Amino acid sequence: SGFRKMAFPSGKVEGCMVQVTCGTTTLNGLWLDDVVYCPRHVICTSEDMLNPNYEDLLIRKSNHNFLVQAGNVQLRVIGHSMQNCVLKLKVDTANPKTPKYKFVRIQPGQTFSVLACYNGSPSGVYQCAMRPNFTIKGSFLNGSCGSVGFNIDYDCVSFCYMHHMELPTGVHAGTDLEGNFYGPFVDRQTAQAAGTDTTITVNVLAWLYAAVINGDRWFLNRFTTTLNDFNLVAMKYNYEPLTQDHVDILGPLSAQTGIAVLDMCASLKELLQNGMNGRTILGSALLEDEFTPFDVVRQCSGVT
Amino acid sequence: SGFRKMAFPSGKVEGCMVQVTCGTTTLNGLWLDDVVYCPRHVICTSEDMLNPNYEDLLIRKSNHNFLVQAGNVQLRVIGHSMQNCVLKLKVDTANPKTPKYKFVRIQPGQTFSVLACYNGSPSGVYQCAMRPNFTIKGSFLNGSCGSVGFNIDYDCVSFCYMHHMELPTGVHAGTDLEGNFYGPFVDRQTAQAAGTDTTITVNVLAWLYAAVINGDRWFLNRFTTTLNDFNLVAMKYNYEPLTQDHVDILGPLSAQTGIAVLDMCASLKELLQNGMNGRTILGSALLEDEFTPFDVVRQCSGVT
Ligand SMILES: O=C(Nc1cccnc1)Nc1cccc(Cl)c1
Ligand SMILES: O=C(Nc1cccnc1)Nc1cccc(Cl)c1
């Protein structure tokens, strides 16, 4: 029992972190096989960041200008290429620590672990959700760029995120490992509108099932609701509309607890309309949305 | 910017996890050098757990009865010994993945990362605080015993905790790596009183400084207080009494923000007496106490 915001074990990802330097900028790279991936803004200077012409900035750079260091060993760069907002540096040595890996583009509302790094060295690991508006509320400082987000299925690391920037609002933006930004963001030092965010309804419901499994049941009530009635409440409280797909994904949790999904929706409806009344659920005084139904089943079953 | 409940990178600890089986019980062991450490209750059966005579149960066991598996390789056990509530299994092979390590007994209120494991395999990593009452509010299932808590200072892993049991209340109890329980707990299937817990005042204050550094300043006020006046409020709200040692430890955070420690104490006093008024601080609707001043400085400075 007990429920924590649990990150994946970061060992397989720590073995992939390197330092990338170009000119006066140093950030993190991910070394998989004979390729080092890093944000393309490593090639910029303070004069460039307002509206960099990346194609032009990269033309002034040669293989020898990209200094890649993995701990104490220097990697030899034999090729460089820009793919969207990421640079791919071909190196002459395949990473002996390369795990089984995939590059995936996660969907908004899905979760992942972030291994925050500075100068190619890991500082910490935390669990994140990709917000419905494609931002992440992380913990990153200048130098953390190139830190990656990932999920692990037994021995395969699915990399889903690479950190690129902090918006003027303090929220974070980045790309998939093909350099495609999540959201409307561009890698420029400019004010950029993050769209209206909503709460990930299916995750809140999954976390309410996690609460029930772990003994916190005060919020359960004698009511039920329909998808339509619930969705009017979700609309009013800036919650993502619930669909039958979401109900279907909550099936295992519904089967384990014996509480029908629409009955849990009626609990959530009462928590939205009345608040917590100074009470807590799994140590929280607000409705948590950064656990998916998959995360709940995995944590409550002990998947390694 | 941003503030997360950040765990240490778990790679150095994942390389130490093994599976320990004795009879019909399987749990986790920590393999450091040529020694495997695990909870001594691995030698019990369901008939024994109410009041095991560990000395007697261990006498019926030989080196060949302790099956230690590190992934796919079996380790050869050449010695066994009980030290307090831990078994030390001498193996003929030193762990090639042994990092620089220390065994430390942490103080209540200090934090650490837990690498939850099942059958010698890591499932996840999370940050914990040792409660003032020597319990930990973790996430552990049956089979998680032997999972360890640790801190990392550059390349040295200070192991501080090994998981032994879940109390009937759902909170967790365990030992240091010499087998000494934290708190009054004994490794028996019996109801055991956890003492009255309090909130870790110095940590809440450290987290209020983390909030200020990251832009959340609404709670700051025009008031100040004394250690004595604050301690009367702390007494009323079951907060640990604040001492000059705690104020001294908050010195760096006080210097960085320019907010005197007693001024931050007056903010905390108003939050205790008036609550949050439906507002949040660093994404939380309650006062967080699982970040030490050291954790705040480290996260806000980027120590790797
Ligand atoms: O945000 C940037 N760095 C940073 C700082 C703090 C936290 N995370 C990241 N650098 C940057 C500046 C302007 C545009 C771009 Cl793409 C990158
Ligand atoms: O608690 C025990 N296991 C467990 C289950 C769930 C979460 N954490 C641990 N086993 C045990 C039973 C009785 C006394 C002792 Cl020391 C150990």
XYZ file of C-alpha atoms and ligand atoms in Angstrom:
642
model
C 0.000 0.000 0.000
C 0.802 3.708 -0.317
C 0.813 5.855 -3.461
C 3.696 7.942 -4.703
C 4.532 10.039 -7.770
C 6.929 7.370 -8.971
C 9.508 7.808 -11.692
C 11.018 4.958 -13.738
C 14.492 3.707 -12.661
C 16.820 6.038 -14.591
C 19.895 3.786 -14.941
C 19.443 2.905 -18.608
C 19.056 6.631 -19.450
C 22.027 7.799 -17.243
C 24.280 5.543 -19.355
C 23.240 7.599 -22.462
C 23.877 11.126 -21.159
C 26.761 13.122 -22.621
C 27.842 16.799 -22.609
C 27.652 18.739 -25.908
C 29.584 21.945 -26.394
C 29.567 24.198 -29.412
C 31.335 27.513 -29.140
C 30.462 28.873 -25.697
C 27.231 26.896 -25.137
C 27.173 23.630 -23.235
C 24.110 21.418 -22.876
C 23.093 17.721 -22.679
C 23.081 15.149 -25.417
C 21.647 11.628 -25.597
C 24.131 9.100 -27.050
C 22.332 6.080 -28.589
C 24.330 3.731 -30.846
C 26.761 5.999 -32.834
C 24.524 9.111 -32.705
C 24.350 11.997 -30.209
C 21.047 13.901 -30.074
C 20.819 17.386 -28.601
C 18.763 20.629 -29.015
C 19.894 22.582 -32.053
C 20.072 25.820 -30.012
C 23.515 24.545 -28.783
C 24.862 26.375 -31.927
C 23.487 29.800 -30.876
C 25.011 32.713 -28.954
C 23.075 35.377 -26.897
C 22.935 37.633 -30.010
C 21.236 34.827 -32.034
C 18.493 33.556 -29.702
C 15.863 36.266 -30.533
C 15.328 34.817 -34.053
C 18.110 32.395 -34.962
C 18.602 31.388 -38.575
C 19.574 27.818 -37.631
C 20.380 26.803 -41.237
C 22.899 29.660 -41.475
C 24.313 29.202 -37.945
C 24.909 25.476 -38.579
C 26.727 26.121 -41.880
C 29.504 27.923 -39.951
C 30.000 24.738 -37.847
C 32.119 21.723 -38.652
C 32.339 18.233 -37.045
C 35.374 19.344 -34.984
C 33.396 22.282 -33.468
C 30.965 19.921 -31.621
C 32.713 18.770 -28.463
C 31.017 15.651 -27.093
C 32.198 14.300 -23.749
C 30.837 11.167 -22.032
C 32.173 11.436 -18.494
C 35.927 11.700 -19.058
C 36.106 10.375 -22.660
C 35.875 12.519 -25.701
C 33.830 11.232 -28.631
C 35.001 11.802 -32.214
C 32.338 13.506 -34.381
C 32.271 12.242 -38.000
C 28.936 13.758 -39.122
C 26.359 16.384 -38.153
C 22.814 17.024 -39.319
C 19.831 19.029 -38.224
C 16.471 17.261 -38.107
C 13.729 19.755 -37.159
C 14.941 21.279 -33.794
C 17.517 18.531 -32.966
C 21.092 18.070 -34.015
C 22.287 14.526 -34.729
C 26.011 14.108 -34.285
C 27.345 10.917 -35.775
C 30.214 9.642 -33.630
C 32.759 6.889 -34.486
C 31.937 4.778 -31.393
C 28.611 3.112 -30.617
C 27.550 3.695 -26.962
C 28.319 0.403 -25.184
C 25.604 1.366 -22.676
C 22.869 1.775 -25.359
C 19.726 0.063 -24.053
C 16.833 -1.369 -26.156
C 15.121 1.860 -27.206
C 12.383 3.489 -29.247
C 11.576 7.082 -30.183
C 7.942 7.803 -29.491
C 5.735 10.837 -29.680
C 3.521 10.752 -26.604
C -0.028 12.053 -26.486
C -1.137 14.935 -24.227
C -2.238 13.590 -20.829
C 0.310 10.741 -20.948
C 3.055 10.646 -18.311
C 6.839 10.124 -18.386
C 9.967 10.347 -16.259
C 12.476 13.138 -16.750
C 16.158 12.722 -15.960
C 17.320 16.289 -15.281
C 20.974 16.743 -16.276
C 23.628 19.553 -16.228
C 26.901 19.249 -18.203
C 26.018 15.674 -19.178
C 25.578 14.641 -15.528
C 22.288 13.452 -14.007
C 21.018 15.499 -11.062
C 17.602 13.928 -10.442
C 14.577 12.085 -11.740
C 10.901 13.004 -11.537
C 7.564 11.972 -13.025
C 5.786 14.485 -15.387
C 2.629 14.633 -17.450
C 2.521 16.182 -20.888
C -0.164 18.842 -20.249
C -3.206 18.931 -22.590
C -1.625 22.229 -23.893
C 1.700 20.402 -24.682
C 3.746 22.087 -21.974
C 5.321 20.241 -19.035
C 5.555 21.630 -15.516
C 9.115 20.474 -14.845
C 12.149 21.515 -12.812
C 14.874 22.749 -15.146
C 17.622 25.346 -14.903
C 19.839 26.914 -17.606
C 22.082 24.035 -18.726
C 19.307 21.383 -18.360
C 18.519 21.574 -22.127
C 18.990 18.176 -23.738
C 17.575 16.382 -20.647
C 15.125 13.697 -21.841
C 11.756 12.238 -20.879
C 11.074 8.539 -21.228
C 9.053 5.477 -20.321
C 10.360 1.906 -19.818
C 8.584 -1.354 -20.783
C 10.743 -4.108 -19.126
C 14.110 -3.488 -20.946
C 13.020 -1.039 -23.691
C 13.347 2.734 -23.114
C 10.849 4.732 -25.141
C 12.248 8.209 -25.336
C 9.478 10.747 -25.736
C 10.772 14.180 -24.825
C 13.891 16.351 -25.028
C 14.019 19.647 -23.069
C 14.469 22.807 -25.095
C 13.180 25.824 -23.230
C 11.482 27.613 -20.427
C 8.711 29.914 -21.559
C 8.520 33.407 -19.944
C 5.731 31.912 -17.748
C 8.081 29.359 -16.103
C 6.523 26.329 -17.834
C 8.612 24.041 -20.077
C 8.644 23.218 -23.772
C 10.456 20.652 -25.815
C 10.435 18.209 -28.672
C 10.095 14.503 -29.481
C 13.496 12.851 -30.433
C 12.960 13.728 -34.124
C 13.128 17.455 -33.100
C 9.417 18.161 -33.502
C 8.114 20.473 -30.772
C 5.185 19.379 -28.713
C 2.733 22.255 -29.093
C 2.981 25.470 -31.087
C 6.395 26.366 -29.679
C 9.451 27.483 -31.644
C 13.051 27.490 -30.367
C 13.380 31.339 -30.157
C 13.737 33.717 -27.166
C 10.298 35.213 -27.690
C 7.051 35.323 -25.694
C 4.952 32.379 -26.833
C 1.371 31.706 -26.015
C 0.735 28.377 -24.352
C -2.910 27.539 -25.038
C -5.559 27.136 -22.353
C -4.723 24.101 -20.249
C -7.317 21.723 -18.805
C -7.139 18.990 -16.119
C -6.665 15.392 -17.379
C -10.009 13.929 -16.301
C -9.148 10.276 -17.003
C -6.029 10.608 -14.823
C -7.943 12.221 -11.930
C -10.403 9.283 -12.070
C -7.495 6.803 -12.219
C -6.014 8.478 -9.114
C -9.422 8.307 -7.337
C -9.335 4.519 -8.001
C -5.753 4.470 -6.605
C -7.096 6.262 -3.483
C -9.862 3.627 -3.009
C -7.361 0.734 -3.407
C -5.172 2.370 -0.742
C -7.872 3.008 1.874
C -8.907 6.623 1.161
C -12.651 6.216 0.517
C -14.280 9.255 2.245
C -15.095 10.861 -1.176
C -17.238 7.912 -2.363
C -20.940 8.754 -2.345
C -24.448 7.306 -2.946
C -24.716 8.999 -6.372
C -24.173 8.221 -10.002
C -24.097 10.371 -13.166
C -24.120 10.071 -16.984
C -21.235 10.941 -19.385
C -23.349 13.962 -20.487
C -24.099 15.252 -16.972
C -20.485 14.701 -15.884
C -19.194 16.489 -19.026
C -21.247 19.613 -18.196
C -19.416 19.737 -14.780
C -16.063 18.976 -16.513
C -16.787 21.863 -18.951
C -17.466 24.284 -16.032
C -14.285 23.295 -14.134
C -11.901 23.168 -17.157
C -11.610 19.399 -17.146
C -11.059 17.409 -20.360
C -14.371 15.949 -21.645
C -14.692 12.251 -20.714
C -15.280 9.826 -23.619
C -16.186 6.093 -23.797
C -12.472 5.458 -24.711
C -11.484 6.927 -21.306
C -14.178 4.811 -19.518
C -12.795 1.704 -21.371
C -9.229 2.468 -20.278
C -10.541 2.722 -16.646
C -12.077 -0.793 -17.030
C -9.373 -2.721 -15.118
C -9.527 -0.262 -12.176
C -13.330 -0.404 -12.267
C -13.173 -4.262 -12.194
C -10.673 -4.407 -9.332
C -12.596 -2.009 -7.052
C -16.123 -2.936 -8.092
C -16.944 0.789 -8.475
C -18.496 1.535 -11.859
C -16.733 4.340 -13.784
C -19.861 6.567 -13.801
C -20.149 6.131 -10.006
C -16.525 7.371 -9.656
C -17.437 10.262 -12.034
C -20.235 11.221 -9.541
C -17.644 11.268 -6.719
C -15.440 13.557 -8.852
C -18.452 15.749 -9.714
C -19.134 16.257 -5.951
C -15.416 16.999 -5.275
C -15.453 19.611 -8.086
C -18.669 21.299 -6.886
C -17.911 21.122 -3.112
C -14.100 20.931 -2.875
C -12.267 18.825 -0.272
C -13.694 20.484 2.897
C -10.157 20.568 4.363
C -9.586 16.847 3.766
C -6.892 15.034 1.754
C -6.729 12.184 -0.772
C -3.456 10.187 -0.963
C -1.665 13.027 0.854
C -2.986 15.704 -1.526
C -5.386 18.618 -0.891
C -6.097 18.991 -4.651
C -7.242 16.608 -7.439
C -4.135 14.955 -8.930
C -4.011 14.440 -12.705
C -0.430 13.191 -13.314
C -1.130 9.453 -12.975
C -2.624 7.577 -15.920
C -4.777 4.425 -15.417
C -1.702 2.479 -16.639
C 0.498 4.107 -13.978
C -2.073 3.225 -11.261
C -2.353 -0.468 -12.314
C 1.489 -0.724 -12.612
C 2.149 0.847 -9.194
C -0.650 -1.109 -7.464
C 0.461 -4.444 -9.083
C 4.275 -4.076 -8.864
C 5.423 -4.185 -12.515
C 9.269 -4.111 -12.704
C 12.574 27.337 -12.644
C 9.915 24.900 -11.425
C 9.984 22.698 -8.320
C 9.515 18.959 -8.251
C 9.724 16.147 -5.691
C 12.967 14.954 -7.230
C 14.613 11.624 -6.562
C 18.330 10.895 -7.055
C 19.322 9.088 -10.303
C 18.953 5.415 -9.325
C 21.494 3.823 -11.703
C 24.213 3.151 -9.138
C 21.633 1.456 -6.854
C 19.952 -0.594 -9.687
C 23.357 -2.212 -10.325
C 23.297 -3.516 -6.683
C 19.832 -5.105 -6.612
C 19.561 -8.891 -6.420
C 16.788 -11.410 -5.610
C 17.078 -13.418 -2.359
C 15.114 -16.602 -1.857
C 15.021 -18.780 1.214
C 12.509 -21.586 1.302
C 9.303 -20.153 -0.158
C 10.013 -16.450 0.507
C 11.542 -14.191 -2.110
C 12.584 -10.595 -1.487
C 15.265 -8.037 -2.492
C 18.889 -7.938 -1.510
C 21.572 -5.273 -1.937
C 24.860 -6.697 -3.288
C 27.852 -4.494 -2.328
C 31.371 -5.922 -2.752
C 31.103 -9.671 -1.816
C 28.143 -9.225 0.581
C 24.372 -9.410 0.002
C 22.194 -7.561 2.530
C 18.516 -8.371 2.954
C 15.791 -8.341 5.691
C 16.150 -11.314 8.006
C 12.416 -12.118 7.693
C 13.336 -13.830 4.344
C 13.891 -16.962 6.563
C 10.303 -16.989 7.924
C 7.131 -18.774 6.803
C 3.485 -17.616 7.458
C 3.423 -19.734 10.669
C 6.536 -17.896 12.006
C 5.753 -14.210 11.387
C 3.595 -13.642 14.545
C 6.672 -13.933 16.829
C 9.617 -15.433 14.956
C 12.570 -16.785 16.895
C 15.068 -15.590 14.265
C 18.078 -17.188 16.017
C 16.355 -20.590 15.868
C 14.956 -20.143 12.331
C 18.414 -19.191 10.996
C 20.092 -22.230 12.597
C 18.025 -24.520 10.324
C 19.470 -22.663 7.277
C 22.717 -23.322 5.474
C 24.643 -21.302 2.825
C 23.101 -23.434 0.037
C 19.535 -22.576 1.216
C 19.957 -18.841 0.345
C 19.385 -18.493 -3.384
C 20.815 -15.194 -4.625
C 20.199 -14.229 -8.244
C 21.501 -11.056 -9.932
C 19.500 -10.869 -13.147
C 20.259 -14.223 -14.775
C 23.407 -15.176 -12.790
C 23.378 -17.143 -9.623
C 25.729 -16.064 -6.841
C 27.515 -18.660 -4.696
C 26.921 -18.133 -0.945
C 29.988 -18.923 1.216
C 28.832 -17.365 4.520
C 25.725 -16.098 6.313
C 25.261 -13.994 9.426
C 22.510 -12.073 11.117
C 23.282 -8.532 12.257
C 20.263 -7.083 14.108
C 17.332 -7.428 11.579
C 19.513 -7.938 8.440
C 21.100 -11.011 6.981
C 24.560 -10.655 5.433
C 25.287 -13.284 2.827
C 28.931 -13.502 1.898
C 29.229 -14.394 -1.786
C 32.369 -15.534 -3.693
C 32.158 -12.717 -6.284
C 32.479 -8.993 -5.600
C 29.743 -6.977 -7.410
C 31.508 -5.418 -10.419
C 28.834 -2.692 -10.308
C 29.562 -1.727 -6.650
C 29.648 2.078 -6.471
C 31.497 4.226 -3.860
C 29.205 3.737 -0.865
C 28.586 4.407 2.807
C 26.093 3.072 5.346
C 24.491 5.937 7.198
C 21.780 6.271 9.778
C 19.711 9.288 8.782
C 17.984 11.599 11.227
C 14.190 12.074 11.350
C 13.144 14.890 8.996
C 15.940 14.079 6.518
C 14.989 12.946 3.010
C 16.106 10.112 0.703
C 15.256 8.330 -2.530
C 13.729 4.867 -2.516
C 14.250 2.405 -5.348
C 11.199 0.131 -5.110
C 12.034 -3.396 -6.296
C 10.210 -6.774 -6.747
C 12.146 -10.037 -7.303
C 15.420 -8.100 -7.490
C 14.093 -5.857 -10.281
C 13.611 -2.085 -9.970
C 10.069 -0.837 -10.576
C 10.386 2.856 -9.691
C 12.082 5.608 -7.747
C 10.592 8.226 -5.440
C 11.692 10.791 -2.865
C 10.711 10.166 0.837
C 11.222 11.830 4.186
C 11.919 9.877 7.338
C 8.953 11.087 9.444
C 9.689 12.576 12.905
C 8.057 9.314 14.234
C 10.549 7.157 12.196
C 8.007 5.812 9.729
C 8.087 6.525 5.986
C 5.006 7.085 3.850
C 6.168 5.007 0.885
C 4.698 2.896 -1.908
C 5.510 -0.759 -1.293
C 3.761 -4.040 -2.021
C 4.426 -7.581 -0.718
C 7.765 -8.524 -2.311
C 9.206 -4.959 -2.028
C 11.064 -5.882 1.219
C 14.793 -5.360 0.790
C 14.227 -2.210 -1.339
C 16.640 0.500 -0.127
C 16.680 4.238 0.528
C 19.732 6.315 -0.274
C 21.325 9.671 -0.973
C 24.133 10.423 -3.475
C 26.993 12.941 -3.038
C 28.635 13.093 -6.541
C 29.757 9.399 -6.902
C 29.167 8.101 -3.341
C 25.863 6.366 -2.472
C 24.982 6.682 1.198
C 22.542 3.917 1.898
C 20.252 4.844 4.757
C 17.199 2.615 4.700
C 16.111 -0.946 3.917
C 12.370 -1.769 3.713
C 11.064 -4.342 6.155
C 7.354 -3.937 6.719
C 4.026 -2.285 6.357
C 2.343 -1.536 9.654
C -1.415 -2.324 9.959
C -1.950 1.445 9.377
C -0.430 1.349 5.851
C 2.721 3.289 6.809
C 6.198 1.765 6.347
C 8.971 0.667 8.679
C 12.510 -0.431 8.122
C 16.098 -0.429 9.246
C 19.477 1.197 8.579
C 21.935 -1.163 6.684
C 23.241 -2.568 10.001
C 19.694 -3.981 10.618
C 18.713 -1.475 13.300
C 15.075 -0.403 12.971
C 14.272 3.245 12.725
C 11.755 3.772 15.520
C 10.351 1.348 18.075
C 9.420 -1.248 15.461
C 10.172 -4.972 15.575
C 10.061 -7.369 12.603
C 6.908 -9.283 13.766
C 3.354 -9.473 12.327
C 1.857 -7.588 15.250
C 0.068 -4.251 15.700
C 2.719 -1.685 16.572
C 2.173 1.813 17.759
C 3.789 4.472 15.619
C 4.222 7.509 17.866
C 2.556 10.866 17.277
C 3.940 12.381 14.095
C 4.578 16.098 13.601
C 5.273 18.234 10.492
C 8.964 18.980 9.728
C 8.945 22.746 10.284
C 12.428 23.425 8.875
C 11.458 21.620 5.650
C 8.183 23.561 5.279
C 10.197 26.805 5.637
C 12.777 25.527 3.119
C 9.918 24.795 0.683
C 8.452 28.303 1.274
C 11.889 29.679 0.227
C 11.752 27.368 -2.844
C 8.301 28.859 -3.637
C 9.669 32.452 -3.432
C 12.652 31.590 -5.698
C 10.197 30.135 -8.234
C 7.727 33.038 -8.338
C 5.051 31.963 -5.822
C 5.096 34.903 -3.381
C 1.389 35.518 -2.516
C 1.907 34.115 1.050
C 4.582 36.700 1.978
C 3.255 39.302 4.404
C 4.152 42.536 6.273
C 4.699 40.652 9.564
C 7.487 39.150 11.575
C 7.577 36.886 14.659
C 9.990 35.550 17.315
C 11.159 31.904 17.747
C 8.995 31.812 20.927
C 5.825 33.206 19.317
C 6.274 30.976 16.255
C 6.851 27.908 18.489
C 3.514 28.474 20.278
C 1.784 28.282 16.812
C 3.963 25.254 15.857
C 2.909 23.585 19.160
C -0.817 24.180 18.381
C -0.553 22.811 14.809
C 1.685 19.774 15.587
C 4.755 21.240 13.942
C 8.282 20.439 15.175
C 9.613 23.255 17.423
C 11.997 25.540 15.489
C 15.499 25.971 16.978
C 18.442 28.308 16.167
C 20.115 25.255 14.463
C 17.166 25.128 12.011
C 17.380 28.942 11.428
C 21.172 28.507 10.767
C 20.553 25.725 8.242
C 18.051 28.082 6.463
C 20.827 30.748 6.245
C 21.754 30.190 2.569
C 18.075 30.355 1.489
C 17.582 33.439 3.667
C 20.667 35.076 2.019
C 19.585 34.251 -1.532
C 16.027 35.606 -1.149
C 16.754 38.451 1.251
C 13.838 37.284 3.450
C 14.898 36.874 7.073
C 14.048 33.445 8.554
C 11.728 34.948 11.219
C 9.865 36.857 8.469
C 9.296 33.524 6.634
C 8.172 32.027 10.001
C 5.497 34.817 10.168
C 4.299 33.815 6.669
C 4.058 30.183 7.849
C 2.267 31.279 11.044
C -0.404 33.066 8.910
C -0.742 30.011 6.591
C -1.244 27.767 9.665
C -3.840 30.059 11.289
C -5.718 31.002 8.059
C -5.040 28.120 5.641
C -4.515 28.611 1.892
C -7.901 30.247 1.062
C -8.192 27.941 -1.982
C -4.764 28.924 -3.328
C -1.695 26.792 -4.116
C 2.062 26.957 -3.495
C 4.342 25.152 -6.002
C 1.336 23.145 -7.228
C 0.313 22.072 -3.709
C -2.805 22.936 -1.664
C -1.084 21.872 1.606
C 2.221 22.776 3.344
C 4.936 20.442 2.006
C 7.523 19.102 4.465
C 9.493 16.550 2.376
C 12.182 18.927 1.072
C 15.108 19.822 3.320
C 16.980 23.166 2.954
C 19.773 21.095 1.325
C 17.329 19.634 -1.217
C 16.044 23.155 -2.061
C 19.562 24.632 -2.582
C 20.602 21.545 -4.655
C 17.506 21.642 -6.890
C 17.607 25.445 -7.308
C 21.400 25.423 -8.073
C 21.640 22.278 -10.262
C 24.008 19.981 -8.319
C 24.722 16.785 -10.345
O 15.065 28.259 -22.352
C 16.282 28.125 -22.369
N 16.986 27.561 -21.339
C 16.420 27.089 -20.128
C 16.520 27.814 -18.947
C 15.818 27.392 -17.829
C 15.048 26.249 -17.927
N 14.951 25.518 -19.046
C 15.633 25.938 -20.118
N 17.065 28.532 -23.415
C 16.558 28.993 -24.650
C 16.268 30.338 -24.852
C 15.446 30.716 -25.903
C 14.927 29.762 -26.768
C 15.290 28.442 -26.593
Cl 14.716 27.248 -27.719
C 16.106 28.038 -25.555
O 5.225 -6.204 5.960
C 5.552 -7.129 5.226
N 5.540 -7.038 3.860
C 5.132 -5.898 3.123
C 3.893 -5.844 2.494
C 3.473 -4.654 1.922
C 4.313 -3.559 1.986
N 5.522 -3.589 2.565
C 5.914 -4.744 3.115
N 5.957 -8.348 5.695
C 6.203 -8.631 7.056
C 5.188 -9.082 7.893
C 5.341 -9.002 9.269
C 6.511 -8.494 9.817
C 7.534 -8.123 8.969
Cl 9.035 -7.563 9.644
C 7.407 -8.191 7.596
